[PDB]
Amino acid sequence: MAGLGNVTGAVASGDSLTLTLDNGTSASDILELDVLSEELLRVDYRPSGAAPSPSTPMIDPDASWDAVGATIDTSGDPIVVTTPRMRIEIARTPARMTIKKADGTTLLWEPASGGVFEDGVRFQRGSTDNIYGIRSFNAQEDVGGLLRNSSDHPAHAGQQGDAGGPFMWSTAGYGVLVDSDGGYPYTDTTGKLEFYYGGTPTEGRRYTKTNVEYYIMVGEPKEIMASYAQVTGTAPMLPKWSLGFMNFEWGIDQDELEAHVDGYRARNIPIDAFALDYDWMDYGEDNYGEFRWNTDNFPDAATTQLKEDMEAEGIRLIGIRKPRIITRDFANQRTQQYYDADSNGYFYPGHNEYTDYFIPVTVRSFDPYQQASRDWWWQHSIDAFDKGIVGWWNDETDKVDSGSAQYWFGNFSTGFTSQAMYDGQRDYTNDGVRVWQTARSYYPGAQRYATTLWSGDI
Amino acid sequence: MAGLGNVTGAVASGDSLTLTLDNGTSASDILELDVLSEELLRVDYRPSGAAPSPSTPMIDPDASWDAVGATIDTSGDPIVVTTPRMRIEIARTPARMTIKKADGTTLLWEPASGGVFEDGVRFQRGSTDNIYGIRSFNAQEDVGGLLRNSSDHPAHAGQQGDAGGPFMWSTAGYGVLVDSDGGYPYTDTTGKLEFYYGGTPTEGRRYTKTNVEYYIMVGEPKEIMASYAQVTGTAPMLPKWSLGFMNFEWGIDQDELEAHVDGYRARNIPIDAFALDYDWMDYGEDNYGEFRWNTDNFPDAATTQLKEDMEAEGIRLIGIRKPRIITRDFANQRTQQYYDADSNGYFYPGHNEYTDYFIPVTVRSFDPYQQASRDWWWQHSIDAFDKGIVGWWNDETDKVDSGSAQYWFGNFSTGFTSQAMYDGQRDYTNDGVRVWQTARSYYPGAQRYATTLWSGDIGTQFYKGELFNWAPGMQEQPRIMLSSANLGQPKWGMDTGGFNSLGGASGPNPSPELYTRWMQFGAFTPVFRVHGNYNQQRQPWLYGATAEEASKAVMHTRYSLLPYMYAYEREASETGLGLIKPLLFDYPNDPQAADYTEAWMFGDWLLVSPVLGEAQHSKQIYLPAGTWIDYHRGQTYSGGQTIHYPVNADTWTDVPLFVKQGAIIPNQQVLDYVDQQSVTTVNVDIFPSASETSFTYYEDDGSSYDYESGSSFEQRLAAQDLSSSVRVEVGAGSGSYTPDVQHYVLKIHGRAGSAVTAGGSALTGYGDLQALQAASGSGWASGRDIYGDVTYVKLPAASGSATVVEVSGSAPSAATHAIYEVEDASRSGATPTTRAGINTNHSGYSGSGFVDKLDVPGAAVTVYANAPVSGDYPVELRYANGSGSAKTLSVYVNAARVQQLSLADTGAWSQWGTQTTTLPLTAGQNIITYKYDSDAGDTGGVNLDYIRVPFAPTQAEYAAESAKLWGGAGTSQDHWFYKGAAFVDNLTGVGAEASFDVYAPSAGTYNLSLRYANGTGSTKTLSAIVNGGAASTVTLTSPGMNWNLWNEHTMTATLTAGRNTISFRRNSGNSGNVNLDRLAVSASAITTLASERNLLDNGDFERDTTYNSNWTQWQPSGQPSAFGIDSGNALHPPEGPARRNQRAYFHSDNAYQQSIHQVVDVPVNNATYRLEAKVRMKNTTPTTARAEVQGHGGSPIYANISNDGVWKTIVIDNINVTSGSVDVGFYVDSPGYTTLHIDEVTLTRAP
Ligand SMILES: [Ca+2]
Ligand SMILES: [Ca+2]
Ligand SMILES: [Ca+2]
Ligand SMILES: [Mg+2]
Ligand SMILES: [Mg+2]
Ligand SMILES: [Mg+2]
Ligand SMILES: [Mg+2]
Ligand SMILES: [Mg+2]
Ligand SMILES: [Mg+2]
Ligand SMILES: [Mg+2]
Ligand SMILES: [Mg+2]
Ligand SMILES: [Mg+2]
Ligand SMILES: [Mg+2]
Ligand SMILES: [Mg+2]
Ligand SMILES: [Mg+2]
Ligand SMILES: [Mg+2]
Ligand code: NI
Ligand code: NI
CATH class of the missing domain: 2.60.120.260 (Galactose-binding domain-like)
Incomplete structure (x- = not known):
């Protein structure tokens, strides 16, 4: 894609420079440069001078900087912007930016083939520079290093511990940050440093930008990171207790919590917090159960008592939250939280309701191949039979499929499961009550034990 | 591949023909043909005439046929078998079968290239014949037709409605059935009709056949199907009601069932049966709940009433069954059905425990991008916040993965979810309560709303692929942390110990080694947390004494550094830079820092490189430019090199940690939690460099956003090493918060001054640190520590003006021992109110007091003491014993019981004595504990004043x-x-x-x-x-x-x-x-080291169990061994070792006898030895359980093991050896379910 055309106008004003570029039409492109600090430049490319789109939530909406008093020299070619820490040259014909340290060392530049354009930014830099940022690695991926010297991974929040963003920087002394909702950073060892908006990414895109808003940082890594935090925001201070040890736990009630806290305190093992999983809340219930303390697990959470007794033992409580609501309770009724969310439009766009599980049970497959096993299986079924179960719906005699658990039953499993009930029932009733069963697999011989076949979860 | 050889013998007999086939050997192949009916032939090929294997359950074990009266003509070539319906020809040379209709029409034949062979059958037939059978289609597959003319799908039962088998037949007039457990039928349109046993199928193989048994059917499709049913069995008649309509239902109770039946009957819509899903049974409960009627859903199923009333309405009931049992009740206890199945071996082979769910819920994602939605979300959170949820663990803000539901949240979802709680909480509390949150993704901007990042559902393993490949482990985590820091999110943490294992939540916990190393690592990361899977436990005491003590030790280091760490929390609010950083931040031009992740900076002044390798004995640590000091061992290393760093794989006590030249490190007494009390003295450890360095100490309320409007306190501390002095500046206080700190104690390393000045005034000198601390007003003192010479300077904090302190001269201390006052050490006990105590109510003590209340079982005090090298250190304990007689206490070092101390009466409670004991210390930090160990026979009941540890070992x-x-x-x-x-x-x-x-x-x-x-x-x-x-x-x-x-x-x-x-x-x-x-x-003659007293091999069972040891074992002939060695991490909760990683166990579900024994020659005969061991026994009381000493010259000596469920120390003292040998052992005689653990076995020379 083509780079910018020639500079037809250059208006300096304080720490800002507004360039007008020829595109062959009556609506010229505008490139706005703003020197935010001595080592931070904001660039805004507006194709055909259109008004800029709103910035994404990457940008700190309250950000402000002191005046810099940069020198802007439009008198010749290139146009030159200077601070005590950096020198920016914009060549006039065509418009191309070169970023230098104040001492003249070239850091990065827009190549003759083209730099900024309507879908992103394109720089060239030293081919041996070490690049960082862009992406991290999630809990389901191969885990690489810190270097990003040959990267085409997209910029995204990701999942399962991942982190990412349109932020690419170098120990060679520069950083680039593009305001964007996802997109496609690209680097290679010929020295390319690029970023493309591209098509709608996997995660979706809810903030579209017609303009291209980006930031160039100059300095050592700590200076680059500080400038990043100026643009996107610093972190508020967390409570001091959050520097302590925390025990997160799923499967826990008030008595167990109290015993855990006593175990730590008795041993003089420091600890400041417990985090509670589903256990803390009435997840699955009506009337905002997923926001409400579970007083079956935590009786003293009926009032402020649990909070205060734990605080008196130096323990703060953290609770798990899921960004979703229960739309049908355990009794299959629509919930109050559903009606409120649906009438106000509070559901995530494109996300429909779905069935999910949350209460685990631990199980293990039995072996119907053994006569003794079959005898035991029948013997424990007699009471249910006497009280009305006269047909045996034998489900899942074929294959387990649960997370990492992917166990096959052997070819005679249906026949033998069927045999357990057939032999047992015939013995028990003295051949007086016909056997009926169904299974969802068949292998030759299984028919001897009075079983039908059904076609599974169609 | 090869076919049969030549017929060399043919024996007719009734409807049976037996052929002997040449194979080159004296054991000829046998082929038996049996005419079962006029249109059904059985063929049994037996390689080398071996006996046939048992037929699989395919074959009807009771099948019977009437005599056929077939004509078997062996007089020529081919041999000919005939019935009215078929003609079978076997050619003699080589043996090949041709099957024809009685009228002579050829149906199928074995080609010249090969027919039957050891692994299956191979036929040729008309290329245009239509083939059927073999397979059907499941509910997850593309559904084809009936034809099987080009089929290579295996023969299997399959899943989800599939059907299949080794049965291939044609409408051209023939069928082939092979007896087999799975296998591989093959057809193609050249006319091949083949079946191969092949390798073990996906579904397993439990019936293996050395022979090849198959059946040939002749006739029209219905005759073929009838013959198939003769071989494999006919179907018994089902109840007539099963021809009726049936309503299967999931989500149903007795009232709803009755309404359904009424609905059908009122409308005259016929129906014979209802089938009930999970609803009918107590699935999930103990005592065979998965076989028991659920009388909450179906009250009248308490008796035969429901059955009888439904029968009166013409309804039969069908119940869902799964071929599995519940192994855990809803209180996480083993179920009765588990014990019965486990003890009898009723589980499916290769199938381990796993996680199921059976109670679904319906959910839908919320949109945090809308202001009104966020307002709503917060409003409904207020009540939980008021009742104690003060931190928000915002899980799954990234992606849904549930069945057909695979939805992504957008890049700003974590930021917006965080904003909801942040804006809401700040408004509701009037900026009075600081927000804490965590999420498992990050995108730029999210940090504005007070959220950390954690690395998701990581694996419980050392590295990716150690145990499984689908999640990373511990060693990958520094790369994730530092990649997050490179994106501007340094507030990062991980599930220390791991979350995922093979088998889900029922899968194993971390080994004690993995847990210990992970805790050491996590303690030097920003957000320090443990987090296991459902019903897993991550408390340190469950992983054995090494994990408990090593974890405790590193936690004390972290909490001592609160004032250091907290300044980095403030720094993140001004620049975004946090508590950790990769080395490349400080060394942007060093190629060896460019991708370095095995070490990182913890604040500005500490480089940490945790031991992350299993069984790791040493580390290669890159130190970048500068001069580095080992934090625990004291030595100096020049920068710009990779150092070889020895680690003690036996103790797990090392956390490699290095102080950067110029370090200024505020630290404090260890608290149980951050605001447990006011800290009025802050220590500042200073390692001065030639260039000035500085650290700005920081306090605020820890709690509110008052800091944002100037309500905080700071003081700039700066240091420089000059030509012949050290200069330290404590700047003037700044800000409006009144800090708790009243004094700094500066510990200036590298110089023991002769004078310390401040503002044209020499400060008053005191004798030692203790005397300086007790003094009010300013002062100095000097001494020695692990690093060398040190000058202590006590100054007031929060003065309105700057103080410049100058340390000059050099007068090194002559001290030979470090002193540790035990009242400043770690006090513990069995419960929070039975911990050892501090007191001052008897005179004669050193320091500010002494330790008392060592008189309830389990009370202890623990000192963390650094040593420069591993070796023997005679450690002096100062104590008082006014009881009137000797009292005992255990001394533990790095979680090993080194000795029982006998502490003599000192005359009175105000009169003190000393006891010196040689302790085996390791280089770096050592954990020295004095304990009332009632379970080892200690009495307790003394008061302890201090210990003194020599700076140098004797050897x-x-x-x-x-x-x-x-x-x-x-x-x-x-x-x-x-x-x-x-x-x-x-x-x-x-x-x-x-x-x-x-x-x-x-x-x-x-x-x-x-x-x-x-x-x-x-x-x-x-x-x-x-x-x-x-x-x-x-x-x-x-x-x-x-x-x-x-x-x-x-x-x-x-x-x-x-x-x-x-x-x-x-x-x-x-x-x-x-x-x-x-x-x-x-420097002197070398004698036996305190670490090398044990005469047994592998007494602690720590050796990798791939390798054997001097232990032998015995059980009764015919009984399986009850003995093993493992970590106890597979259990929930874990039942770990007494020390380190492993312990022996005896266990069987059934009655058993078991022993282990070890015989050693002693170094000195006609002398006294002592056996000591840790033992823990639980569940069923055994008839016999004991340690045994024999073969020593005297009669056997026994020590019985009690059934208490806790680790106890067993001791057999006074073994007088005259044989030159001792046999030590353990023996159990149990009726079943006695579990004994054995660990830390030592045989030593008795003083
Ligand atoms: Ca060795
Ligand atoms: Ca003392
Ligand atoms: Ca051990
Ligand atoms: Mg400005
Ligand atoms: Mg565009
Ligand atoms: Mg628990
Ligand atoms: Mg309590
Ligand atoms: Mg409730
Ligand atoms: Mg016969
Ligand atoms: Mg055809
Ligand atoms: Mg074979
Ligand atoms: Mg229903
Ligand atoms: Mg009725
Ligand atoms: Mg019940
Ligand atoms: Mg007392
Ligand atoms: Mg040992
Ligand atoms: Ni990613
Ligand atoms: Ni199939």
Whole structure:
């Protein structure tokens, strides 16, 4: 894609420079440069001078900087912007930016083939520079290093511990940050440093930008990171207790919590917090159960008592939250939280309701191949039979499929499961009550034990 | 591949033909043909005439046929078998069968290239014949047709509605059925009709067949199907009601069932049955709930009433069954059905426990992007916040993964979810309560709303692929952390211990080793947390005493650093930079920092490199430019190099941690939690460099956003090492918050001054740190610590003006011991109110007090004491005992019970005595605990004032396995009687070497003793090279052909002050081929080390169980062994070892006898020995359970093991050996379900 055309106008004003570029039409492109600090430049490319789109939530909406008093020299070619820490040259014909340290060392530049354009930014830099940022690695991926010297991974929040963003920087002394909702950073060892908006990414895109808003940082890594935090925001201070040890736990009630806290305190093992999983809340219930303390697990959470007794033992409580609501309770009724969310439009766009599980049970497959096993299986079924179960719906005699658990039953499993009930029932009733069963697999011989076949979860 | 050979014999008999086939050998192949009916032939091929295997359950075991009266003509070629319906021809040379209709029409034949063979059957037939059978289609598959003319799908039962089998037939008039457990039918349109047993199928194979049994059917489709049913069985008649309509239903109770039936009957819509899903049974409950009627859903199923009433309405009931049992009740206890199934072996082979769910819920994602939605979300959160949820664990803000639901949240979802709680909480509390949150993704901007990042559902393993490949482990985590820091999110944490295992939540916890190393690592990361899977536990005491004590120790280090760490929390609010950073932040131009992740910076002044390797004996640590000081061991290293760093794999006590030149490190007394009390003295450890460095100390309320409007306190601390002095500036206080800190105690390392000034005034000098601390007003003192010379300076904090302190001169301390006042140490006990205490109510004590309340079982005090090298340290304990008689306490070092101390009466509670005991300390931090261990026979009941630890050992030790190995030398556990965690072997090629880093207090001649094995039967040699000097020959005799014998080679060496290298190497003239274990070093004659008293091999069961030991075992003939060795981490909750990683166990579900024994020759005969062990026993009380000592010259000695469920120490003292040997052992006689654990077994010379 083509780079910018020639500079037809250059208006300096304080720490800002507004360039007008020829595109062959009556609506010229505008490139706005703003020197935010001595080592931070904001660039805004507006194709055909259109008004800029709103910035994404990457940008700190309250950000402000002191005046810099940069020198802007439009008198010749290139146009030159200077601070005590950096020198920016914009060549006039065509418009191309070169970023230098104040001492003249070239850091990065827009190549003759083209730099900024309507879908992103394109720089060239030293081919041996070490690049960082862009992406991290999630809990389901191969885990690489810190270097990003040959990267085409997209910029995204990701999942399962991942982190990412349109932020690419170098120990060679520069950083680039593009305001964007996802997109496609690209680097290679010929020295390319690029970023493309591209098509709608996997995660979706809810903030579209017609303009291209980006930031160039100059300095050592700590200076680059500080400038990043100026643009996107610093972190508020967390409570001091959050520097302590925390025990997160799923499967826990008030008595167990109290015993855990006593175990730590008795041993003089420091600890400041417990985090509670589903256990803390009435997840699955009506009337905002997923926001409400579970007083079956935590009786003293009926009032402020649990909070205060734990605080008196130096323990703060953290609770798990899921960004979703229960739309049908355990009794299959629509919930109050559903009606409120649906009438106000509070559901995530494109996300429909779905069935999910949350209460685990631990199980293990039995072996119907053994006569003794079959005898035991029948013997424990007699009471249910006497009280009305006269047909045996034998489900899942074929294959387990649960997370990492992917166990096959052997070819005679249906026949033998069927045999357990057939032999047992015939013995028990003295051949007086016909056997009926169904299974969802068949292998030759299984028919001897009075079983039908059904076609599974169609 | 080859077919049958020539017929050499044919024996007709009724409807049976038996053919003998040439195969070149004396054991000829046999082919039996049996005419079962006029249109059904059985063929049994038996390679080499071996007996046939049992038929699979395919075949009807009771099948019977009437006599056929077939004509079998063996007089010619081919041999001919005929019935009215078929004609079977077998050609003689080679044996090939052709099947024809009686009228002569050819149906199928075995081709020349081969028919039947050892692994299946191969036929040829008309290429245009239509083939059927073999397979059907499941509910997850593309659904084809009926034709099987080009089929290579296996024969299997399959899943989800599939059907299949080794049955292939044609409408051209024939069928083939093979008896087989799975297999591979093959057809193609050249006319092939084949079946191969093949390798083990996906579904397994439990019936293996050496013979090939198959059936040939002739006729129209209905005759073929009838013949199939003769062989495999007909179907019994189902109840007539089963021809009716049936309503299956999930989500149903008795009232709803009755309504359904009424609905059908009112409308005259016929129906015969209802089938009930989970609803009918107590699935999930103990006592066979999955076989029991659920009387909450179906009250009238308490009796036969429901059955009878439904029968009266014409309804039969069907119930869902799953071929599995619930192994855990809803209180996480084992179920009765589990015990019955486990003890009888009723589980499916290869199927382990797993996680199921059966109660679904319906959910839908919320949109945090809308202001009104966020307002709503917060409003409904207020009540939980008021009742104690003060931190928000915002899970799954990234992606949904549930069945057909695979939805993504957008990049700003974590930021917006966080904003909801942040804006809401700040508004509701009027900026009065700081927000804390965590999420498992990050995108730029999210940090504005007060959220950390955690690394998701990581694996419980050392690294990706150690145990499983689908999640990373511990070693990957530093790369994730530092990648997050590179994106501007330094507030990062992980699930220390791991979340995921093979088998889900029922899968194993971390091993004690993994848990310990992970805790050490996590303590030097920003957000320090443990987090297991459902119903898993991550409390440190569950992983054994090493994990408990090592975890506790590092946690104390972290909490001591609260004032250091908290300044980085503030720094993140001004620049975004946080508590950790990769080395490349400080060293942007160093190529060796560019991708470095095995170490990182913790604040500005500490470089940490946790031990992350399993069984790791040493580390290669890159130190970048500067001068670095070992935080725990005290030595200095110049920067710009990779150092070899020895670690003690036996203790797990090392966390490699290095102080950066210029460090200024505020620290404080250890609290149980951050605001437990006001801290009025802050220590500031200063390691001055030639250039000025500084650290701005910071306090605020810890709690509100008042800091944003100036309500905080700071003071800039700065230091510089000058030509002949050190200068420290404590700047004027700044800000409006009144801090708790009243005094700083500056600990200025590297100089013990003769004068300390401030503002034209020399400060008052005091005798020691204790006297300085007790003084009000300013002062100084000097001393020695692990780093060397130190000057202490006590000054007021929060003055309105700057103080400049100058330390000049050099007057080093003559102190020989570090003193640890136990009232400043860690006090513990069995419960929060039975911990050891502090008191001042008897006179004569040192420091501010002494420790009392060591008189309830389990009360203890623990001192963390640094040593520069491993070795023997005589440690002095000051105590008072006014009880009137001797009292006992256990002394533990690095979680091992070293001795029971007998502390004599001192005359009164205000009169003090000392007891000195030689302790085996390891280089770096040591955990020294004095404890009332009632379970080891201690009495307790003394008061303790302090301990004194010498700066230098009486003699030092260096492990060979932790030395720098080169040229092929490696570590090993494959011989017996080594010391520590391993030994060094493979000193085989020229250049092979072990190089030790040995420290000396002064230049001079030292004694060395090298422990080595030489089982070659002749003398061998190495060279010794001291500080790169001239090689000297080390001549190493052999005691014989036994690599389980170790000897000492004694020698001397000239050493310089500080670090020396001593290498043992095969130079070209040397023979090599010895094993090295340990180098001992002393200025005096070397005696037995305190770490090497144990005479048993693998007494702690710590050896990798791949390798054997001097332990033997016994059980009764015919009984399976009840004995094993493992970590106890597979259990929920874990039942760990007494120390380190492993413990022996005896266990069986059924009645059993079991013993283990070890025999050792003692070094000194006609002398007294002592056996000690840790034992824990639970569940069923056994008839007998005891330790045994025998073969020593006297009659057997027994010590019984009680059934208490807790670790106890068993002791057999006064073993008077006159045989030269002792046999030590453990024996159990149980009726079933006695579980005994055994650990830490020692046999030692008794004083
Ligand atoms: Ca004391
Ligand atoms: Ca060793
Ligand atoms: Ca052990
Ligand atoms: Mg400005
Ligand atoms: Mg566009
Ligand atoms: Mg729990
Ligand atoms: Mg309590
Ligand atoms: Mg409730
Ligand atoms: Mg017959
Ligand atoms: Mg055809
Ligand atoms: Mg075979
Ligand atoms: Mg229903
Ligand atoms: Mg009725
Ligand atoms: Mg019940
Ligand atoms: Mg008392
Ligand atoms: Mg030991
Ligand atoms: Ni990613
Ligand atoms: Ni199939």
